[PDB]
């Protein structure tokens, strides 16, 4: 039965009293004066009362109240009565902008009863309790306002200029008379032709913020509706910003939409836009030692050393992508959104480290084997079931060579390296692809470009049957193929040999 | 290719190395299938006819193929785009999407009831005034990806590379673009002072890329060599190098800033505010040509001034 | 109390995306400013490095 009141800047939300002080002289302030402070509204401050009186009211004049129109009329008549030739005809937004500007620049810090609106310490209290009333979005907008406007002026102005500005804030005749005695204070003041670089610096910073905040949602919409029609390389070519800048804009916009809505962010998006960069750059780093970067993955011979290696590189680059994304043909095996969240989430560093070249899948299908009969029967049926998985791999003369590794893990090879895994429930199954590759030397590279269905096949790549007939494979000159075919076929005919004679169906005598 | 084989076969002319490089780079730059298969045929024709194969040609072949990978990928993605368009036009006519729109599994298995019937935890709904709620509403309520363009581009590519197709697709999605053409593009490669500041010291903004308030690059509050004073001093030294480049004529003269105007002599501020001058060169034209201005002190444009041309240019 | 002392004196925060090297290198298209460091390491190692 409670209605939560809507909170905004006009009536601020009440906060706790254990909050840290944003400003520096309030951190070392004694706590007796902290308890002396009363919880008043924001306009009860004299600086807040001034800002509500002359600045916020003139911005409230933009609406369609009748008092707004009458104040607009008397303000037009007032600044026409000031001088006629300078502001002959301009709109009401222009006249309230002009009076807002003139009331902003005429602000001084003295005593409240001496004719001045507020003191300096009241302004510092307003800044402190204004920064305390901000969340992280408000602090982000405050830092953005610092970067857009105050940062170029601080980058251009000298420290004697900000000392002069501090003396203008404090408005003390003693400190101004003390600083006017210094020759180095008066002579080292900044010149306006050097100060005019602040406009170009401010324009460049606001241009970068216009790249971020104004071009950002358009790129986000164009990439999020149809990414196969507008990929990031197409957007980077048609807008001309950069490739990594466009991808950073997309990642920052999705994480900003997630963080501002109190939603856990989709962590798979930097894995999807920076996939090659995630495999290349992101490493686990220890504390007390420095690391390097591998220039190449392998010690190899260059492709410029021979014409055939050059032609092989050019033919592989034509059969390759330039940038692969989540929607391309190598990622077309992700037919389920559960597989989509499994591959890009929490196991992408394991899924990409399975096979170096990108294939139509990630591993190999698992098949199980038959158990040989145990002639003791149920006396020994319990003994194969155990606690752990028992993995067995083959070795020997034919088996265990890494140079034929992708030949020894080839399921279309009759002399494949035999693996078995007995499960704790007694099941004999084959090994997975990473399980078969774990028994060899480590292969820690990945190919992110070449896709083998894009290979050329019509002009120069024409494998001929006469080249395979040059080896002259014959069945009469060698009987090993027919012997393996005899070893493959079942031998059930040997028991019904006497039961040219050819095998026929059983003839029935009940129906005949 | 027609003029190439007409030059070779009919007129019996031996082609030069440059026109072999042209037929190599034309098939390389074209993203159609088999372009490099014909570029290697032109390379073989250069090899077996005594035409010189330079290493710069090989490096340019690798660079041009890596650059035309974008065109190759666009012409490969347009085929899947056309396949998805045909499948969408089939399945919206047969009516499978009307049967798939009804969430019978969500109606039987509710969001708060699991498969057995216990009560499960559901996340609270986000505010509809947020950005993410509007983004998922724009994902659900707008038109499909297959209804944006009926035909594809003229040369193998999907539509949307130009700005007219981009603006039309944004109109179909209910978005009026703030940047209609390429002159309303901010173009960060034109910046000269800002990459010079970013290269030596670091990012002058800091809070340009900040997710939750921890990715910001700012100097420390303790002071010393990492404090604000040394960083602002070094940024002022880099701005002083840029201003020395301005003074010697390598860079154009900057316009009048509010910080520059507020420190000036008050009579110069009066002349600027009555003239409307943006650059101090316009202020120098306002002072050195008093017969040019209007009656309210306003500055006349450039086209209303004509200098005296001497007769000694007729020699 | 035995967990309050053992802090993270072993690990460090990971490399961000598009990060640079501790020697100052970076993976750009132009590797003229980047250098190799295979010649600074010892010539022979007793065992096998993880790289």
């Amino acid at each position: 039965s409670f209605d939560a009141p809507q909170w905004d800047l006009w009536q601020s939300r009440p906060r706790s009293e254990d909050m840290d002080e944003a400003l520096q002289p309030f951190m070392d302030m004694p706590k007796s004066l902290k308890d002396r402070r009363y919880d008043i509204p924001w306009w009860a401050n004299p600086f807040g009362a001034w800002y509500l009186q002359n600045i916020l009211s003139l911005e409230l004049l933009k609406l369609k109240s009748k008092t707004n129109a009458e104040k607009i009329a008397t303000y037009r008549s007032y600044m026409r009565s000031l001088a006629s030739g300078k502001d002959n005809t301009m709109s009401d937004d222009d006249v309230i902008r002009n009076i807002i500007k003139e009331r902003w620049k005429t602000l001084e810090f003295g005593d409240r009863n001496a004719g001045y609106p507020c003191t300096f310490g009241d302004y510092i209290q307003f800044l402190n309790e204004w920064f305390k009333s901000l969340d992280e979005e408000g602090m982000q907008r405050l830092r953005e306002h610092f970067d857009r406007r105050i940062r170029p002026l601080l980058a251009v102005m000298s420290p004697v200029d900000i000392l002069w500005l501090e003396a203008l804030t404090q408005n003390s005749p003693h400190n101004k008379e003390q600083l006017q005695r210094k020759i180095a204070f008066q002579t080292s003041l900044g010149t306006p032709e050097f100060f005019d670089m602040s406009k170009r610096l401010r324009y460049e910073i606001n241009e970068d913020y216009k790249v971020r905040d104004e071009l950002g949602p358009e790129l986000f919409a164009l990439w999020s509706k149809a990414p196969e029609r507008w990929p990031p390389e197409r957007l980077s070519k048609m807008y001309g910003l950069d490739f990594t800048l466009v991808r950073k804009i997309l990642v920052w916009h999705h994480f900003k939409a997630c963080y501002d809505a109190c939603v856990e962010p989709d962590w798979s998006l930097p894995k999807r836009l920076f996939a090659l960069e995630w495999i290349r750059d992101v490493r686990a780093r220890k504390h007390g030692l420095f690391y390097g970067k591998m220039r190449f993955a392998e010690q190899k011979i260059t492709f410029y050393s021979d014409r055939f290696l050059f032609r092989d590189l050019v033919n592989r680059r034509e059969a390759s992508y330039a940038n692969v994304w989540e929607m391309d043909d190598p990622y077309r095996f992700l037919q389920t959104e559960q597989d989509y969240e499994d591959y890009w989430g929490d196991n992408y560093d394991v899924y990409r480290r399975m096979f170096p070249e990108m294939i139509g899948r990630t591993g190999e299908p698992v098949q199980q084997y038959g158990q040989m009969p145990i002639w003791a029967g149920p006396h020994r049926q319990h003994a194969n079931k155990s606690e752990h998985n028992w993995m067995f791999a083959e070795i020997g003369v034919n088996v265990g060579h890494e140079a034929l590794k992708k030949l020894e893990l080839d399921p279309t090879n009759e002399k494949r390296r035999r693996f078995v895994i007995r499960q704790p429930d007694g099941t004999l199954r084959s090994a997975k692809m990473s399980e078969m590759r774990a028994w060899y030397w480590k292969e820690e590279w990945a190919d992110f470009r070449f896709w083998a269905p894009q290979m050329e096949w019509g002009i120069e790549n024409t494998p001929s049957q006469e080249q395979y007939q040059e080896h002259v494979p014959d069945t009469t000159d060698a009987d090993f193929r027919k012997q393996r075919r005899i070893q493959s076929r079942p031998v059930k005919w040997f028991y019904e040999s006497h039961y040219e004679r050819e095998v026929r169906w059983p003839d029935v005598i009940n129906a005949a | 290719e027609k003029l190439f084989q007409e030059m070779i076969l009919k007129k019996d002319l031996s082609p030069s190395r440059r026109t072999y490089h042209c037929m190599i780079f034309m098939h390389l730059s074209s993203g159609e299938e088999g372009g490099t298969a014909r570029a290697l045929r032109y390379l073989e024709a250069m090899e077996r006819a005594g035409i010189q194969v330079r290493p710069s040609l090989l490096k340019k072949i690798v660079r041009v193929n890596n650059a035309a990978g974008y065109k190759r990928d666009m012409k490969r993605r347009a085929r899947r785009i056309m396949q998805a368009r045909e499948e969408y036009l089939a399945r919206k006519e047969e009516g499978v999407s009307f049967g798939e729109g009804g969430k019978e599994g969500a109606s039987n298995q509710r969001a708060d009831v699991d498969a057995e019937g216990n009560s499960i935890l559901e996340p609270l709904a986000v505010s509809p005034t947020s950005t993410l709620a509007w983004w998922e509403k724009w994902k659900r309520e707008t038109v499909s990806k297959h209804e944006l363009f009926t035909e594809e581009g003229a040369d193998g590519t999907p539509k949307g590379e130009t700005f007219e197709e981009k603006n039309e697709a944004l109109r179909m999605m209910g978005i009026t673009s703030s940047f209609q053409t390429k002159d309303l593009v901010p173009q960060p490669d034109r910046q000269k002072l800002l990459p010079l500041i970013r290269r030596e010291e670091g990012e002058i903004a800091g809070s340009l890329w900040a997710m939750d308030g921890g990715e910001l690059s700012y100097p420390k509050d303790g002071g010393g060599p990492q404090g604000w004073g040394v960083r602002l001093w070094r940024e002022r030294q880099l701005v002083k190098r840029e201003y020395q480049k301005v003074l010697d004529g390598y860079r154009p003269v900057p316009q009048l800033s509010t910080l520059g105007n507020s420190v000036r002599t008050a009579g110069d501020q009066l002349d600027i505010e009555r003239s409307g001058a943006q650059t101090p060169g316009e202020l120098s034209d306002y002072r050195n040509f008093p017969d040019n201005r209007f009656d309210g002190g306003q500055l006349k444009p450039e086209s209303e001034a004509a200098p005296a041309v001497p007769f000694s240019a007729e020699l | 109390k035995v967990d309050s002392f053992h802090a993270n004196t072993q690990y460090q925060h990971a490399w961000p995306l598009l990060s640079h090297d501790d020697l100052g290198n970076s993976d750009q298209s132009n590797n003229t400013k980047n250098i190799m460091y295979s010649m600074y390491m010892p010539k022979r190692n007793k065992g096998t490095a993880p790289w």
């Binding site: 944003a22 951190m27 600045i55 610092f146 105050i150 002026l153 500005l165 501090e166 | - | -």
Partner: peptide, 30 residues
């Protein structure tokens, strides 16, 4: 260990009178 700073010198720059020089900085940009 080490404490990540909240950058409290961001707020000390707002104590200066930027309205006197920047001619109405604290409002919206024109």
């Amino acid at each position: 260990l080490n404490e990540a700073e909240k950058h409290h010198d961001l707020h000390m720059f707002y104590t200066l009178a930027w309205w006197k020089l920047g001619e109405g900085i604290f409002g919206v940009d024109e």
